[PDB]
Design an enzyme around this catalytic site. Structure first.
Site, PDB file in Angstrom:
ATOM      1  N   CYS A  80      10.338  24.234   7.049  1.00  0.00           N
ATOM      2  CA  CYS A  80       9.633  24.149   8.328  1.00  0.00           C
ATOM      3  C   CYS A  80       8.920  25.441   8.630  1.00  0.00           C
ATOM      4  O   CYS A  80       9.481  26.503   8.421  1.00  0.00           O
ATOM      5  CB  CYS A  80      10.592  23.759   9.446  1.00  0.00           C
ATOM      6  SG  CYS A  80      11.373  22.143   9.215  1.00  0.00           S
ATOM      7  N   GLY A 136      14.651  23.942   5.401  1.00  0.00           N
ATOM      8  CA  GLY A 136      14.242  25.336   5.506  1.00  0.00           C
ATOM      9  C   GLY A 136      12.754  25.563   5.300  1.00  0.00           C
ATOM     10  O   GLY A 136      12.252  26.662   5.550  1.00  0.00           O
ATOM     11  N   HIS A 141      10.483  23.654  17.428  1.00  0.00           N
ATOM     12  CA  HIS A 141      11.840  23.118  17.281  1.00  0.00           C
ATOM     13  C   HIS A 141      12.850  24.176  16.763  1.00  0.00           C
ATOM     14  O   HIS A 141      14.045  23.898  16.745  1.00  0.00           O
ATOM     15  CB  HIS A 141      11.906  21.796  16.476  1.00  0.00           C
ATOM     16  CG  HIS A 141      11.603  21.915  15.013  1.00  0.00           C
ATOM     17  ND1 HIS A 141      12.491  22.510  14.136  1.00  0.00           N
ATOM     18  CD2 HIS A 141      10.557  21.424  14.311  1.00  0.00           C
ATOM     19  CE1 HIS A 141      11.933  22.408  12.941  1.00  0.00           C
ATOM     20  NE2 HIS A 141      10.770  21.760  13.000  1.00  0.00           N
TER      21      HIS A 141
HETATM   22  C1  LIG Z   1      15.563  13.962  12.011  1.00  0.00           C
HETATM   23  C2  LIG Z   1      15.743  15.266  12.754  1.00  0.00           C
HETATM   24  C3  LIG Z   1      14.609  16.269  12.655  1.00  0.00           C
HETATM   25  C4  LIG Z   1      13.675  16.382  13.680  1.00  0.00           C
HETATM   26  C5  LIG Z   1      12.786  17.441  13.676  1.00  0.00           C
HETATM   27 CL1  LIG Z   1      11.746  17.679  15.053  1.00  0.00          CL
HETATM   28  C6  LIG Z   1      12.757  18.362  12.652  1.00  0.00           C
HETATM   29  C7  LIG Z   1      13.653  18.233  11.596  1.00  0.00           C
HETATM   30  C8  LIG Z   1      13.618  19.209  10.441  1.00  0.00           C
HETATM   31  C9  LIG Z   1      13.191  18.585   9.127  1.00  0.00           C
HETATM   32  O1  LIG Z   1      12.791  17.423   9.049  1.00  0.00           O
HETATM   33  N1  LIG Z   1      13.280  19.415   8.066  1.00  0.00           N
HETATM   34  C10 LIG Z   1      12.857  19.163   6.749  1.00  0.00           C
HETATM   35  C11 LIG Z   1      11.532  19.283   6.335  1.00  0.00           C
HETATM   36  N2  LIG Z   1      11.056  18.864   5.158  1.00  0.00           N
HETATM   37  C12 LIG Z   1      11.913  18.305   4.315  1.00  0.00           C
HETATM   38  C13 LIG Z   1      13.294  18.134   4.577  1.00  0.00           C
HETATM   39  C14 LIG Z   1      14.196  17.552   3.651  1.00  0.00           C
HETATM   40  C15 LIG Z   1      15.521  17.431   3.953  1.00  0.00           C
HETATM   41  C16 LIG Z   1      16.011  17.876   5.173  1.00  0.00           C
HETATM   42  C17 LIG Z   1      15.175  18.439   6.096  1.00  0.00           C
HETATM   43  C18 LIG Z   1      13.788  18.586   5.831  1.00  0.00           C
HETATM   44  C19 LIG Z   1      14.573  17.190  11.611  1.00  0.00           C
END
Ligand SMILES: CCc1cc(Cl)cc(CC(=O)Nc2cncc3ccccc23)c1
Ligand SMILES: [Cl-]
EC number: 3.4.19.12
Lengths: 297, 302
Positions: free
Chosen positions: B145, B143, B41
């Site tokens: 990921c 960040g 992604h």
């Molecule tokens: C709903 C859209 C989406 C789809 C996908 Cl395939 C990936 C994301 C990125 C994501 O979840 N990153 C993160 C990871 N962990 C914790 C996180 C806390 C807050 C904000 C991002 C966080 C987002």
């Protein structure tokens, strides 16, 4: 989101762990520059026992390489073995003595080999509730500030209650302990109040608000209640330290104190805070900021 | 003595963390040999979130679109390929700090350490269990990921997880190092909900054995149970069914402490019925399920 008991990345400290053997005893050493630090109990009159030792009595092993000892001296309860080779993996480091309530990561080692890393708090009774088996002596506690490792603890012994006792990196014990086989007991422990409050702020940052109430309290009224539940006194310094969390969440420190006061007199009532049924006191206010904002090393 | 939620020393994994930038997105990569692994992604835009075609998006990218940074050194991407949900960026330099490693897919209940990174920089290490609902209850911010889960058994790092996303409940979803998600999750911002979570029964039993090894016996009782009767009770408290494999796995702990598995099961049945009564087991007022039978033996023996 999420709250975990998180340790500092242990890599900079793993590059310093060596195995120290003297006679039948084998424990761990911290090799920084051309000196290997380890508990002096690896050699009681320690000045007399040490004068009988020669450099070749201490077998120091760094991985599969033997380090040759070219000198030995004692500083309090720590033995300093001067070696011929400076550790190339020596990081930017400091020896710091911590205060009770302060947290640090422990790199548990057996035979100079790191096996686990966990996060600890120096209990107000100066013991740490660690996880140690025979051979872990010489394992170290540390913090990382930017790219500098602050060494704050070296494991020396286990008390009859299963709790641990050790020194700072200058060999000064934390607590009223001595490095010998005798009757030694950990004092009555108390809860680190400022840390419970920091962890309550962490729960609010994570969306847990059930414990919040409309009330506030005076610092004196809170400390009268805290004393009754074996909680450490909350000082004005602690309030100021909790300031950024108070500003971030909109809950004044004395306002969170009134939540803690109710939590102590009434309990949690089958409810949990950050997946815990107990009030957690091993997260300092800085640990909560570092974890709930994202500081890297 | 003492029982702690212990993570593996993170050093071998820290030497592999890099920063991967593609357009506006910056996340973490795992640099092993001459390949950098990261969530696919990283190539998504704002409108390529709900229904992205990753094969189509990747074919439009060139090697110079991916900026890989290892410390203060920029790595040159010389190839890119996709394996399921992970992106593999072939680089011109092999990581000198590459440890002896393996890619292992874990099963629910299994534990692993997570090295949380931001901008290719490790900031913390913690212990995790793959929940029965295939999510992990991690501690991740934006960040994170590309951060990885691992086990360091002996001198080999078994990489078992790569963080990909946070579900609406604050729990985390990711893949094994071959890009296969754990659970029914997809790398799309479409409505996805974690299934109802359950307690990892075999792990709670292992942790009860750890408490007995540490001198805690208050919860033990004179009762035993059949495996079926235990499961009928366990299901009512949202506990995973205990299988005969689990009973077999608990065998060494049963032999060490002298408490038969079905005997320890009757103790667990009673704990579920009564609660703790203001008591703690290993300093916990809840039944702990993120220590496997293997973790208990390693921490309580070596
Ligand atoms: C709903 C859209 C989406 C789809 C996908 Cl395939 C990936 C994301 C990125 C994501 O979840 N990153 C993160 C990871 N962990 C914790 C996180 C806390 C807050 C904000 C991002 C966080 C987002
Ligand atoms: Cl597994």
């Amino acid at each position: 989101s999420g709250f975990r008991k998180m340790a500092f990345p242990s890599g900079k400290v793993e590059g310093c762990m060596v195995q120290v053997t003297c006679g039948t005893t084998t424990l761990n050493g911290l090799w920084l520059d051309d000196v290997v630090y380890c508990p002096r109990h690896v050699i009681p009159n320690y000045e007399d026992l040490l004068i009988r030792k020669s450099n070749h009595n201490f077998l120091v092993q760094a991985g599969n390489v033997q380090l040759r000892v070219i000198g030995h001296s004692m500083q309090n309860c720590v033995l300093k073995l001067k070696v011929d080779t400076a550790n190339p993996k020596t990081p930017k480091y400091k020896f710091v003595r911590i205060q009770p309530g302060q947290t640090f990561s422990v790199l548990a080692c057996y035979n100079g080999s790191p096996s686990g890393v966990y996060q600890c708090a120096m209990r107000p009774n100066f013991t740490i509730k660690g996880s140690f088996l025979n051979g872990s002596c010489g394992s170290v506690g540390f913090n990382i500030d930017y790219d500098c490792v602050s060494f704050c603890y070296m494991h020396h012994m286990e008390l009859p209650t299963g709790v641990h006792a050790g020194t700072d990196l200058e060999g000064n014990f934390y607590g009223p302990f001595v490095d010998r086989q005798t009757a030694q007991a950990a004092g009555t422990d108390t809860t680190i109040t400022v840390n419970v409050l920091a962890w309550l702020y962490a729960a609010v940052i994570n969306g847990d608000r059930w414990f919040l109430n409309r009330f506030t309290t005076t610092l004196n009224d809170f400390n009268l209640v805290a004393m009754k539940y074996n909680y450490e006194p909350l000082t004005q310094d602690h309030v100021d330290i909790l300031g950024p969390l108070s500003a971030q969440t909109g809950i004044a420190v004395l306002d969170m104190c009134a939540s803690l006061k109710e939590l102590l007199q009434n309990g949690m009532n089958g409810r949990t805070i950050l997946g815990s049924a107990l009030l957690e006191d091993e997260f300092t206010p800085f640990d909560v900021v570092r974890q709930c904002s994202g500081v890297t090393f």
